Amino acid sequence: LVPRGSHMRILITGGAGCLGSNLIEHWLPQGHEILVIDNFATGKREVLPPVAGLSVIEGSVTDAGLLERAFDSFKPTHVVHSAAAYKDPDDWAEDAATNVQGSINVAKAASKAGVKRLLNFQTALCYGRPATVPIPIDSPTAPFTSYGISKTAGEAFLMMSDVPVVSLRLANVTGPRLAIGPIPTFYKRLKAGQKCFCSDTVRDFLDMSDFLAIADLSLQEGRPTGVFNVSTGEGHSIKEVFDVVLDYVGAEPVPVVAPGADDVPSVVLDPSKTETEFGWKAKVDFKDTITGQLAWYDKYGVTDIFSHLS
Amino acid sequence: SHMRILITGGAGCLGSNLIEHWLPQGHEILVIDNFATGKREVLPPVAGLSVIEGSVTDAGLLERAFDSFKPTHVVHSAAAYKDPDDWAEDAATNVQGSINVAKAASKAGVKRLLNFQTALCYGRPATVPIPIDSPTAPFTSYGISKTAGEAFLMMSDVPVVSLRLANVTGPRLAIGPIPTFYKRLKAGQKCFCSDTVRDFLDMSDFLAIADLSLQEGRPTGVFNVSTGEGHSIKEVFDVVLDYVGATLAEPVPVVAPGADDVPSVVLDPSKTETEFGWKAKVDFKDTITGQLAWYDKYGVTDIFSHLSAP
Ligand SMILES: NC(=O)c1ccc[n+]([C@@H]2O[C@H](COP(=O)([O-])OP(=O)(O)OC[C@H]3O[C@@H](n4cnc5c(N)ncnc54)[C@H](O)[C@@H]3O)[C@@H](O)[C@H]2O)c1
Ligand SMILES: NC(=O)c1ccc[n+]([C@@H]2O[C@H](COP(=O)([O-])OP(=O)(O)OC[C@H]3O[C@@H](n4cnc5c(N)ncnc54)[C@H](O)[C@@H]3O)[C@@H](O)[C@H]2O)c1
Ligand SMILES: [Mg+2]
Known part of the structure; x- marks a missing residue:
């Protein structure tokens, strides 16, 4: 039905997470039909209220039969792959099963189900220690975690x-x-x-x-x-972030401390190819970005369970 | 210098050749293999040699092998590759398998772990011969x-x-x-x-x-393990023709490489020479000729064992 001529049936893995739930809040009021698959490893049940147009399967992208059944019953036109494992740096087996095997499972199931478009989110950790910052899109992948x-x-x-x-x-x-x-x-x-x-x-x-x-x-x-690459293309220090918070909140000068062994000095993405190819450009600058985050904390607290769905 | 060596994939080409080199020296060897591509014939029931039939994907089996056998050294030679569409098997054997082998070896306190890597890890290289600090950029x-x-x-x-x-x-x-x-x-x-x-x-x-x-x-x-010199497939062909003594009814055509076929893959072994003092001794002609001489004796076979069975 609606939006007329571009209603989507969206299958979203990891839909109970930060990005997933924010996308659901964006798409569901438009009339799109959404199915979430989440194992609640890091995501929250509270962000997925029982509302019309939204279904939720508690399961894993590693479970290939759960996926074939979900793609078969739901018949998505589009897939957003937002499921990732990360919380235990030493559980390589869970990272590999969710992030490698779960991606392969989603890919195979999407291809069989005939989906029009598939959207994946990638961490900048894929670049490891980059040689060029802002990181060009044709930079090698060089992960080390x-x-x-x-x-x-x-x-x-x-x-x-x-x-x-x-x-x-x-x-x-x-x-x-x-x-x-x-x-x-x-x-x-x-x-x-x-x-x-x-x-x-x-x-x-x-x-x-x-x-x-x-x-x-x-x-x-x-x-x-x-x-x-999806960025403003501008980089800001942690100190610069701190300075925006301090002024916002209204409180010895803060020490500049690290960086830790596994911490990459500078990670800033070059979005130039994304601007070219999509005609997209980020509109909200750094100060407004941080400020709007802090404004959200003022209203709801530092919480991950406040739903903007009715 | 006695080794208790656990060799995953020991039934394959490299594994079995390793075993033939090491077992006569008195080393004790355990093999884990699922016989996806390796053959049971190359692993006769001889003193010093144990074979567990099973997968590196099986974390339980691996834990029990490392516990009972207590290896001092590990050669990780198991790899899946035979079906290029079977991404799930490639990921299970090559990613999960490597992780299970790494964790188990770490727990069992092994002295040294040896892995073999395909030059397909380099993808399409920017520099040939490929320096060891080149990016990984696989696409299969x-x-x-x-x-x-x-x-x-x-x-x-x-x-x-x-x-x-x-x-x-x-x-x-x-x-x-x-x-x-x-x-x-x-x-x-x-x-x-x-x-x-x-x-x-x-x-x-x-x-x-x-x-x-x-x-x-x-x-x-x-x-990188190599002579550091590259030879075209035509050059290989030429060595085989001369050796076999055949006469051609038409010149061999040289054809443009396939879609996914990397034009030139030659590795630069200099760092290996610097740090190990190793240098490959056998030149191209002798390498090809030694292969053809083996086929003259035994045929093109992957089941001929050089171990003496009781
Ligand atoms: N938020 C960011 O700024 C950021 C930056 C770079 C990349 N990403 C990527 O975006 C995606 C979402 O990130 P996020 O910030 O929303 O994190 P999130 O932790 O909130 O993750 C989304 C969800 O994945 C779920 N999940 C984990 N394993 C699963 C499994 N096997 N099966 C089904 N669901 C599973 C979790 O329960 C969680 O709800 C991830 O792929 C992440 O790597 C996010
Ligand atoms: N031979 C070469 O020139 C070459 C070149 C570059 C890299 N390598 C690497 O060297 C190693 C050995 O190569 P090869 O030429 O001997 O190939 P191979 O096919 O002969 O041997 C691989 C062995 O692994 C076994 N195997 C597959 N999946 C397994 C699993 N889940 N559990 C246990 N065993 C499993 C197979 O049965 C086989 O015996 C591989 O890791 C390969 O990627 C080989
Ligand atoms: Mg091979």
Whole structure:
């Protein structure tokens, strides 16, 4: 039915996570039909209320029969692959099963089911220690952690698919229900009057609204396929983030501390090919990105369970 | 210098040739193999040799093998590759299998783990001969899963050597251009050579570096194993023609390489020479000729054992 001429039946793996739930909140009010598959390893049941147009299967992308049955009953036109394992750096076996084998399973099931477009999200950890920052899209993959090695292979399998695939390599995305990293940490700590420390690292940040716009473009028939960096292309230090929080919240000068052994000095993506090929560009700058995150904390707390669905 | 060696994939070409080299020296050897491609004939019931039939994907089986056998050394030679559409098997054997082998070896406190890597990990190289610090950029099921496998092994606390190998020739090689030209030329069938360049390594040179790799105090990490010289498939053909003594009814056509066929894959072994002091001794003509001489004696067979069975 609606939206007229472009109703999607969207199968979203990992739909109970941050990105998944934010996409559901974006698409469901438009009339799209959504099916989520999640094992609740990190995602939350509370972000998936029993509303019309939304179904939820508690299961794993590693379970290939659960997937064939779900693709067969639901008949999606589109797939968003957002399921990932990462929480235990030493559980290589779970990373490989979810991130490699689960990607392969989704790919095979999508191809059989005839889906029009498949959207995957890739961690910038795929680049490992880059030689060039901002990282060009044609830079090699060079992961050196369980999460990066497994995601790298996952993406590589997906790119062999006969289904048109977009894999978005992502900046640190901010928005509703983000509850980890420097933004919430500096916010809670500064309100608690606790000592903060800034890693001596450059990172990039993307506002949820800009993430949503490229996700929309990525699922349109006829649009480009392949791997794409999604960023403003600007990098900001952890200290710069801290400074925005401090001023926002209104509290000895903060020490610049690290970086840890496995911490890459600078990770900032070059989005130039994505601008060219999609005509997309990130509209929300750094200050507004962090500020809107902090504004969300003021209203709902540092929580990962506040649903904007009725 | 007595070794208790656990060899996964020991029924295959490299594994079985290793066993023939090491078992006469008094080493105790356990093989784990699922016989996907390796043959039961190459592993006779002799003193010093144990065979468990099973998969590196089976974490339970592996734990029980490492516990009972207590290896001092591990040679990880198991790989899946035969069906390029069977991504799930490639990922299970090559990624999960490598992870199970790494974890089990770590737990059992092995002195040294030896891995073999396909040059498909390099994808389409930017520089030939391929430097050892070149990126991994695989684009096939076999190259992707093996790349991930090796990367997981490199995260082990056990000392690891991973050898990126030229095309190894020796007893029981029954695939590739060498046996194909030998058989076809003797039968009067038309041959064609792809216009590609490759490297070839005699078994004797392979045994030498494998030996060095298993010795305490030796270097660790990734290494290219090669003469460092490349030869076209036409050059291989030419050696086979002359050796077989055939007369051609038309010149061999040299044809443009396939879609997925990398034009030139030759490895630069300099770091291996620097750190190991190893250098490949057998030149191209002698390497090809030694393969053809083996076929003259035994035929193109992968079931002839050089071990003396009771
Ligand atoms: N949020 C970011 O800024 C960011 C940056 C780079 C890449 N990514 C990628 O985007 C995707 C979503 O990230 P997120 O930030 O929303 O994280 P998230 O932890 O909130 O993950 C999404 C979900 O995956 C689920 N999951 C894990 N294993 C599963 C399994 N085997 N079967 C089904 N579901 C499973 C979790 O329960 C979770 O809800 C991931 O692939 C991640 O690697 C995110
Ligand atoms: N021979 C070469 O020139 C060459 C070149 C580069 C890399 N390598 C690497 O060297 C290693 C051995 O190669 P090969 O030429 O001997 O090939 P091979 O096919 O003869 O041997 C691989 C062996 O692994 C076994 N196997 C497959 N899946 C298994 C599983 N799940 N559990 C246990 N065993 C399993 C097969 O039965 C087979 O005996 C492989 O890792 C390969 O990728 C070989
Ligand atoms: Mg092989």
